[PDB]
Write an enzyme that holds these catalytic residues in place. Structure first.
Site, PDB file in Angstrom:
ATOM      1  N   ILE A  46       0.842  -1.190   0.000  1.00  0.00           N
ATOM      2  CA  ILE A  46       0.000   0.000   0.000  1.00  0.00           C
ATOM      3  C   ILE A  46       0.882   1.247   0.000  1.00  0.00           C
ATOM      4  CG2 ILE A  46      -1.772   1.272   1.234  1.00  0.00           C
ATOM      5  CD1 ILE A  46      -2.751  -1.386   2.395  1.00  0.00           C
ATOM      6  N   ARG A  48       5.296   2.537   0.932  1.00  0.00           N
ATOM      7  CA  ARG A  48       6.644   2.262   1.426  1.00  0.00           C
ATOM      8  C   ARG A  48       7.307   3.492   2.018  1.00  0.00           C
ATOM      9  NH1 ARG A  48       8.740  -2.304   1.354  1.00  0.00           N
ATOM     10  NH2 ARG A  48       8.098  -4.039  -0.007  1.00  0.00           N
ATOM     11  N   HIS A  50      11.144   4.604   4.518  1.00  0.00           N
ATOM     12  CA  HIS A  50      12.513   4.198   4.809  1.00  0.00           C
ATOM     13  C   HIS A  50      12.652   3.450   6.142  1.00  0.00           C
ATOM     14  CE1 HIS A  50      13.172   6.385   1.250  1.00  0.00           C
ATOM     15  NE2 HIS A  50      13.394   7.579   1.772  1.00  0.00           N
ATOM     16  N   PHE A  51      11.674   3.600   7.036  1.00  0.00           N
ATOM     17  CA  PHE A  51      11.666   2.877   8.316  1.00  0.00           C
ATOM     18  C   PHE A  51      10.619   1.748   8.398  1.00  0.00           C
ATOM     19  CE2 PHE A  51      14.808   5.194  10.645  1.00  0.00           C
ATOM     20  CZ  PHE A  51      14.768   6.497  10.179  1.00  0.00           C
ATOM     21  N   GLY A  52       9.548   1.848   7.615  1.00  0.00           N
ATOM     22  CA  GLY A  52       8.474   0.861   7.647  1.00  0.00           C
ATOM     23  C   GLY A  52       7.620   0.851   6.384  1.00  0.00           C
ATOM     24  N   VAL A  54       3.493  -0.540   4.582  1.00  0.00           N
ATOM     25  CA  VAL A  54       2.099  -0.874   4.816  1.00  0.00           C
ATOM     26  C   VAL A  54       1.615  -1.755   3.678  1.00  0.00           C
ATOM     27  CG1 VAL A  54      -0.241   0.001   5.160  1.00  0.00           C
ATOM     28  CG2 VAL A  54       1.734   1.307   6.030  1.00  0.00           C
ATOM     29  N   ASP A 166       2.000  15.927  15.147  1.00  0.00           N
ATOM     30  CA  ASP A 166       2.188  15.871  13.698  1.00  0.00           C
ATOM     31  C   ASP A 166       0.834  15.880  12.986  1.00  0.00           C
ATOM     32  OD1 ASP A 166       3.502  15.757  11.237  1.00  0.00           O
ATOM     33  OD2 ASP A 166       3.943  13.591  11.390  1.00  0.00           O
ATOM     34  N   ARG A 170      -1.834  14.748   5.621  1.00  0.00           N
ATOM     35  CA  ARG A 170      -1.169  13.489   5.243  1.00  0.00           C
ATOM     36  C   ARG A 170      -1.369  12.381   6.284  1.00  0.00           C
ATOM     37  NH1 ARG A 170       2.920  17.161   6.390  1.00  0.00           N
ATOM     38  NH2 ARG A 170       3.898  16.830   8.438  1.00  0.00           N
ATOM     39  N   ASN A 171      -1.691  12.772   7.521  1.00  0.00           N
ATOM     40  CA  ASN A 171      -1.807  11.831   8.641  1.00  0.00           C
ATOM     41  C   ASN A 171      -3.246  11.530   9.055  1.00  0.00           C
ATOM     42  OD1 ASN A 171       0.826  10.891   9.471  1.00  0.00           O
ATOM     43  ND2 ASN A 171       1.303  12.996  10.050  1.00  0.00           N
ATOM     44  N   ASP A 184      -1.603   8.965  12.592  1.00  0.00           N
ATOM     45  CA  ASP A 184      -0.198   9.293  12.398  1.00  0.00           C
ATOM     46  C   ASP A 184       0.521   8.072  11.815  1.00  0.00           C
ATOM     47  OD1 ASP A 184       2.461  10.174  12.597  1.00  0.00           O
ATOM     48  OD2 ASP A 184       2.064  11.176  14.516  1.00  0.00           O
TER      49      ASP A 184
HETATM   50  C1  LIG Z   1      -5.669   3.197   0.511  1.00  0.00           C
HETATM   51  O1  LIG Z   1      -4.384   3.532   1.043  1.00  0.00           O
HETATM   52  C2  LIG Z   1      -4.062   3.369   2.384  1.00  0.00           C
HETATM   53  C3  LIG Z   1      -4.960   2.832   3.301  1.00  0.00           C
HETATM   54  C4  LIG Z   1      -4.593   2.681   4.640  1.00  0.00           C
HETATM   55  N1  LIG Z   1      -5.501   2.168   5.494  1.00  0.00           N
HETATM   56  C5  LIG Z   1      -5.201   2.013   6.791  1.00  0.00           C
HETATM   57  C6  LIG Z   1      -3.952   2.376   7.275  1.00  0.00           C
HETATM   58  C7  LIG Z   1      -2.982   2.907   6.432  1.00  0.00           C
HETATM   59  O2  LIG Z   1      -1.737   3.255   6.932  1.00  0.00           O
HETATM   60  C8  LIG Z   1      -1.571   3.496   8.281  1.00  0.00           C
HETATM   61  C9  LIG Z   1      -2.080   4.670   8.804  1.00  0.00           C
HETATM   62  C10 LIG Z   1      -1.961   4.957  10.148  1.00  0.00           C
HETATM   63  C11 LIG Z   1      -1.322   4.086  11.020  1.00  0.00           C
HETATM   64  N2  LIG Z   1      -1.279   4.508  12.322  1.00  0.00           N
HETATM   65  C12 LIG Z   1      -0.754   3.915  13.406  1.00  0.00           C
HETATM   66  S1  LIG Z   1       0.005   2.408  13.345  1.00  0.00           S
HETATM   67  N3  LIG Z   1      -0.846   4.524  14.593  1.00  0.00           N
HETATM   68  C13 LIG Z   1      -1.441   5.717  14.735  1.00  0.00           C
HETATM   69  O3  LIG Z   1      -1.975   6.339  13.822  1.00  0.00           O
HETATM   70  C14 LIG Z   1      -1.450   6.272  16.141  1.00  0.00           C
HETATM   71  C15 LIG Z   1      -2.239   7.557  16.265  1.00  0.00           C
HETATM   72  C16 LIG Z   1      -3.623   7.518  16.384  1.00  0.00           C
HETATM   73  C17 LIG Z   1      -4.344   8.694  16.516  1.00  0.00           C
HETATM   74  C18 LIG Z   1      -3.685   9.915  16.535  1.00  0.00           C
HETATM   75  C19 LIG Z   1      -2.303   9.965  16.419  1.00  0.00           C
HETATM   76  C20 LIG Z   1      -1.575   8.783  16.289  1.00  0.00           C
HETATM   77  C21 LIG Z   1      -0.802   2.893  10.500  1.00  0.00           C
HETATM   78  C22 LIG Z   1      -0.928   2.605   9.131  1.00  0.00           C
HETATM   79  C23 LIG Z   1      -3.318   3.060   5.078  1.00  0.00           C
HETATM   80  C24 LIG Z   1      -2.419   3.592   4.152  1.00  0.00           C
HETATM   81  C25 LIG Z   1      -2.803   3.748   2.810  1.00  0.00           C
HETATM   82  O4  LIG Z   1      -1.963   4.253   1.852  1.00  0.00           O
HETATM   83  C26 LIG Z   1      -0.756   4.964   2.109  1.00  0.00           C
END
Ligand SMILES: COc1cc2nccc(Oc3ccc(NC(=S)NC(=O)Cc4ccccc4)cc3)c2cc1OC
Ligand SMILES: [Cl-]
Length: 303
Positions: A46, A48, A50-52, A54, A166, A170-171, A184
């Site tokens: 989904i 990429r 540099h640290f992790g 999805v 943050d 984007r987040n 985030d």
């Molecule tokens: C359809 O595309 C996507 C779809 C995607 N659906 C799902 C996830 C996605 O990625 C994430 C997004 C976010 C996290 N967040 C994590 S582990 N923790 C937190 O967000 C902690 C936090 C909570 C509330 C306030 C501040 C901080 C992981 C993975 C997705 C990424 C996508 O594309 C880049």
């Protein structure tokens, strides 16, 4: 360096869970997903960084129904601090329960490799990419609506004394019902966001005081929220196309063409020089809900 010619740096090894913080482990243990109950599709990345990374995943519940998820993974598990921060990034959501805040499905610990933080799939991905995508045709009301949603998430998070640090479009994630999940990416930070992190800090979203002390508060989150509002009304333009010196010349982001005047007044309050004079997220919810209610979806905002 993934394949170093030689080890030069001393080797600090964390073993041969017990090496981790007990409270973190306990928290992770009670949201455990069985290694066999999660299918990670490593061929279907989904995003990429540099640290992790999805991946698409599928989770089977006890009823046998397939759940589409996103599976966040750490690129390297050799640093104990990185591993701990990674699990903390997931586990913090276990204590949040709000429709405008991303939830955690669970964490899959397997015998080999990165722990896997499992999140509900967000069909429309990050809010910034959604609004930047020409295909979508959001009105001012839609866009203010998203801001209102972020405000509600932050009101909840602020009520729980959680400092985001943050907050940016984007987040924030956007699900299939166009519900905004404040979030985030943390260590799954997309590789094309590195320009926005200048510690690597998101300087264009940061309050005047945070830029100088590198300290973050709910009031500094309010600043970022203002910038997030700006991002929304410009449909994801980069802010301010050294930022401390710029700001201290007496400047703020210009009013976007599709930003209504009352909403700009709100952004200006979010950027109040004095943090204590910045509106609460509660007041922002109130104010933006009012502004939102005045629109009827007849102003289409261009990319
Ligand atoms: C359809 O595309 C996507 C779809 C995607 N659906 C799902 C996830 C996605 O990625 C994430 C997004 C976010 C996290 N967040 C994590 S582990 N923790 C937190 O967000 C902690 C936090 C909570 C509330 C306030 C501040 C901080 C992981 C993975 C997705 C990424 C996508 O594309 C880049
Ligand atoms: Cl409108």
């Amino acid at each position: 360096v993934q394949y170093p010619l030689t080890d030069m740096s001393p080797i600090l090894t964390s073993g041969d869970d017990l090496s981790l913080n007990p409270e973190l482990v306990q928290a992770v243990q009670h949201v455990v997903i069985g290694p066999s109950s999660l299918i990670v599709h490593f061929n279907e990345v989904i995003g990429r960084g540099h640290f992790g990374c999805v991946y698409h995943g599928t989770l089977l519940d006890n009823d046998g129904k397939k759940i589409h998820c996103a599976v966040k993974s750490l690129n390297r598990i050799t640093d104990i601090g990185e591993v701990s921060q990674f699990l903390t990034e997931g586990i913090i959501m276990k204590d949040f329960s709000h429709p405008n805040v991303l939830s955690l499905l669970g964490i899959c610990l397997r015998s080999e490799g990165s722990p896997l933080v499992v999140l509900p799939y967000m069909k429309h991905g990050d809010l910034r990419n959604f609004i930047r995508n020409e295909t979508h045709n959001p009105t001012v009301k839609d866009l203010i609506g998203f801001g209102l949603q972020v405000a509600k998430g932050m009101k909840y998070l602020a009520s729980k004394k959680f400092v985001h640090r943050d907050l940016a479009a984007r987040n924030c994630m956007l699900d299939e019902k166009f519900t905004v999940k404040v979030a985030d990416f943390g260590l799954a930070r997309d590789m094309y966001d590195k320009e926005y992190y200048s510690a690597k800090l998101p300087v264009k979203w940061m309050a005047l005081e945070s830029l100088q002390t590198q300290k973050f508060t709910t009031k500094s989150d309010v600043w970022s929220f203002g910038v997030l509002l700006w991002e929304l009304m410009t449909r994801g333009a980069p802010p301010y196309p050294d930022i401390t010196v710029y700001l201290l010349q007496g400047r703020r982001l210009l009013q976007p063409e599709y930003c209504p005047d009352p909403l700009y007044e709100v952004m200006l309050k979010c950027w109040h020089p004095k943090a204590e004079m910045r509106p609460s997220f509660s007041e922002l919810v109130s104010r933006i809900s009012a502004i939102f209610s005045t629109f009827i979806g007849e102003h289409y905002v261009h990319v």
